[PDB]
Amino acid sequence: RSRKESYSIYVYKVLKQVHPDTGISSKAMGIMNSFVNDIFERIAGEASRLAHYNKRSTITSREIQTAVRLLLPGELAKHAVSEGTKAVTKYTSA
Amino acid sequence: RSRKESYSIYVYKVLKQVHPDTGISSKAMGIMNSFVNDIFERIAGEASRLAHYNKRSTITSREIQTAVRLLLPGELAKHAVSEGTKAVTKYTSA
Amino acid sequence: KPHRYRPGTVALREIRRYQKSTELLIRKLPFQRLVREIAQDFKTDLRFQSSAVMALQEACEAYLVGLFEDTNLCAIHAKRVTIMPKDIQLARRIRGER
Amino acid sequence: KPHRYRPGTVALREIRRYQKSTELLIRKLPFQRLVREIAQDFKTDLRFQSSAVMALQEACEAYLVGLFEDTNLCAIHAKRVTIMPKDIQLARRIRGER
Amino acid sequence: LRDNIQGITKPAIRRLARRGGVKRISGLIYEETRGVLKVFLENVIRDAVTYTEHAKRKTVTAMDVVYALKRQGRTLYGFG
Amino acid sequence: LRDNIQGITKPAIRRLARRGGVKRISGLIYEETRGVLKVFLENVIRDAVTYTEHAKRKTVTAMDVVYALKRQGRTLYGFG
Amino acid sequence: KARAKAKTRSSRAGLQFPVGRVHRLLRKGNYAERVGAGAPVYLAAVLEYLTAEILELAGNAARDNKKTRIIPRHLQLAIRNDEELNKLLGKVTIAQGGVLPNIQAVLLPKK
Amino acid sequence: ARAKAKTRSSRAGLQFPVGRVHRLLRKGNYAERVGAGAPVYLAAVLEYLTAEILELAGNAARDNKKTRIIPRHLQLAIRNDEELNKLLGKVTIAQGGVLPNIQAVLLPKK
DNA sequence: CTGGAGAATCCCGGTGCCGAGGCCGCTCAATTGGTCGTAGACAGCTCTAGCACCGCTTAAACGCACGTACGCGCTGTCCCCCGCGTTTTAACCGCCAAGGGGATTACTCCCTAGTCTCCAGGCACGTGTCAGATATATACATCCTGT
DNA sequence: ACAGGATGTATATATCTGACACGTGCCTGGAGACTAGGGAGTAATCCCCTTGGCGGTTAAAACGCGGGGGACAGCGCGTACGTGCGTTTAAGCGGTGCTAGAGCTGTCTACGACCAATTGAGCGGCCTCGGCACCGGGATTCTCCAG
């Protein structure tokens, strides 16, 4: 056989975190999966282009942060940068 | 000093083999260099996505061919495919 | 005397109906036949997953609805309430689809 | 009586003049000051290569010329020859800026 | 298959316009809409069939369609 | 460095419209054009400054502007 | 042989999205020959935040639709009602999402 | 004793550098492996596109009574050719200007 | 400016059914742990070019005056599209059946990475010199007033 | 519809002039040669799942018709904008100087790849119940004609 892969469990965990008594259908779950894959690809591609422009061979949290504040608009970018920074600082301590 | 890279001599060779008694300005040569870089990046990125979609790790002449016929329109696509196939055949023949 | 709504009010009612709703507004089988005809123009004896034709229909309906929104904007810009092929052509020209 | 051209004829002749040429139609120093003023809020004491300001001016002029072409098409669509702010708004809305 | 563009009927185009908030529709709109839909469908299907031929496949999958769509700047959610 | 948008003069906007093939220009066009130019410049310069800051530089280079434009689907030829 | 109990990297970062999976995808996606340790953490945090924003707005759209389950229509309403989310996903079409209900003022009855 | 070196561009009958294209493919991390024929195919395509646009731009320069291609000639070549215009419809040529065209409604009435 | 008939829509209450979500077993992918090589951070020196200033010329912006033609409002007319009822048709759903090919696995082979050496293709620099702006003078080409 | 008067714009020559194209010397990055190993091409199988057909139901499409309301042509007018001119302003050119920061350049250290063992997170499959779809019945709202 085979074995697929999706963000379905993670999207469901985030949904139960933000709306504990709200469900989600398979079509909406697939749309969220496509959204996560799309934003992942956009951010990773912009970070790859940043690293290639700056003649760097590694993608760091700086490349991801710059890609996020390039692709995401306004308050969305600000809050995403804050979340990523706090997650990196929490991960470094642990 | 430093050492820069450009397609200037290749663009000039192609110009001379397509218009022997015709020159090109520095700004036009820079525009041609930017055009070659942009089309190279477009074709290579499309071939990269084609290889990643089919769970392949190598970009071959067929990935480049598919990318070309995905990116160039109409007669440009078929003429470029003809040129690439001819070049690959007469390269593998020698 | 039979009841008759004035021209436009039924149009507004179905505007509200089809903007509230979310289903595909094109019959599935004719669209599938159109898709297969175009594909056979491209490659002979192709096969389509049901999800492939469904994705094509979703995309085509979204494109046509957006194009009609821009077309309605063009028609209103000309102090008209009727969309005309000139409005579609202007919308596509500005979008760059021409 | 001094010789005068009718309204719109020297306008047409300078349409031809500015579509025949390629130079930048905005004065360099005011545009450079505008660029530095816009950039000053994003980052202070910021510097610009001369080629960077030239590239910004080229891109801005190309964008404005394309927007004016779309605006002219919008104005002609409404059976007018005078472009109006509503035409720019419609062009930007269809293009995707709004 | 032939003349299947007529399967995109006048009421279907009217419904699509109603979803677009169109109140009044000219009689010539339907043929124009069929033409523009044919052009859009031709572009998307050409790219999708190119993707299918690259995979040495004979079945056009939903992945081919969504890759073709996101190539045109018409990225679609809900199919992978 | 303030009010430098008025440096984009009415004759300059008129010349830009003439290159756009505009025969007649309303009087309110100039402020609207200044607004749209301000928005476009703000977007492009914001992206270019982000690229510059990621490089730890403090001079906006031509390549930063070109990358900023190419991100917005307005790629510019002639500066690298 | 006293190996410590495995802690997933998402738990170390305090995230729900998978840091290890994102790291593998970054490595396998041919974005760079090297991927930093904090890059998947930052990317997973950003993805989780954006997912949380969309899901919060879509759950709100399901609330006033008195539905306890998110459907594509709710996602479309949430995304197109939010200006920033709509700007982020302007070129994206959502299957079975519909459109925002809006009618131009000139088309309404003139009274 | 090594044989005489032959550039892969010469072996493929190309002007554009097959070796440089191969190195750029292997360094732009498009894939972890790059085939032997992929750089020569890409170089052939790039050389053909360069030849097409330079042919059209040189024709424009001749029509402008100039023997040197300038950005204006490249712009005219790109915008007049509808396929080349479709390929480069999102790019702006610096110092290229625009195509000379006036809408017929704006032309003098009588 | 409402009254009331009529049609569409919304609220509500009772089946029911299927898919969303939870549980379980497995397995493969993330962890951990340890090592090694090198990417980049970091300090330091250089020298490019970006910024700032000054003065003069003059092209361009600007403010004003005038007239005209174009935008816009109003009116008529007319015909095209909308609302609606009737007839037709083919979409849709359910079911069946067959076989095409997607897709998964095993084997092998050949094609690409990686190395080492070597040399020549291309780049930085320098230098004549010639398309090509740039001033003239000129020969029409249109524009516009007038008749 | 035709003179002709005037302003503008392609032609036609000198005339410098930077920018271009070509020649040189390096030097670093492709090319020749060889090896190893894993990616992929090929073959076999199997089982989704796609296609094709059939029949009944009925929702939707096609057709026709009456009419009203919106598109469009025409007219009037008045104001905003084009044109031109005199005046003002600051852009542009050409210097000059200076120094901030881009751009190498060498060290080294910390960080990321890679390998092996391990285990638990996540996926495939099963099952079940309740959220929502459907249906039927008022309650409500909006429409439109007639006052």
Numbering used by the authors:
A (entry chain H), B (entry chain D): 31 to 124
C (entry chain A), D (entry chain E): 37 to 134
E (entry chain B), F (entry chain F): 22 to 101
G (entry chain G): 9 to 119
H (entry chain C): 10 to 119
From the paper:
Ubiquitination of lysine residues is a major histone modification that regulates various genomic processes such as transcription, replication, and DNA repair. Histone H2B monoubiquitination (at Lys120 in humans) regulates transcription elongation and DNA repair. In humans, H2B monoubiquitination is catalyzed by the heterodimeric Bre1 complex composed of Bre1A/RNF20 and Bre1B/RNF40. The three Bre1 proteins share a C-terminal RING domain, which is required for the ubiquitination of H2BK120 in humans and H2BK123 in yeasts.
Bre1 binding does not induce a large conformational change in the nucleosome, but a region of the nucleosomal DNA that contacts Bre1 undergoes a small shift (approximately 3 Å).
